[PDB]
């Protein structure tokens, strides 16, 4: 499974419209459905892009 929040990082963003929210900022820029995935060391069964 993907780690929750990996869809939100890399989101194109506007800093002026509002404070930290997914509703400030447009669309995901990165193909992280397809990148090489590493398991996160402190949660077994959860993966993120190696980057």
Partner 1 sequence: SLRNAENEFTRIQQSINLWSLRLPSVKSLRELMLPHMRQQLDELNVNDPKA
Partner 2 sequence: VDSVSASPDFVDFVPTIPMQEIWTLCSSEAQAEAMRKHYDDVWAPAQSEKYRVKANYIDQLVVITGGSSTIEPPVGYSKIEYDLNAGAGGDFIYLCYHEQT
Binding mask of the shown chain, residues 19 to 38, with x at each position contacting partner 2 by CB under 8 A: -xxxxxxxx-x---------
Distances (CA, A) of 41 to 27, 46, 48: 28, 9, 10
Residue 22 CB contacts under 8 Å (≥ 6 apart), including other chains: 8, 11
Pick one of 1, 15, 16, 31: the residue that binds partner 1 (CB under 8 A).
Answer: 31
Give me the 28-47 binding string for a copy of itself, x by CB under 8 A, dash otherwise: -----x----x--xx-x---
| Number of alpha carbons in the 13 Å side-chain half-sphere of residue 8 | 8
Binding site for partner 2 (CB under 8 A): 4-5, 8, 12-18, 20-27, 29
């Amino acid at each position: 499974t993907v780690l929750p929040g990996v869809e939100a990082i890399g989101l194109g963003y506007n800093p002026f419209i509002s404070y930290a929210s997914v509703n400030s900022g447009a669309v995901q820029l990165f193909d992280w459905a397809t990148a090489k995935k590493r398991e996160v060391p402190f949660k077994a069964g959860y993966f993120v892009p190696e980057i």
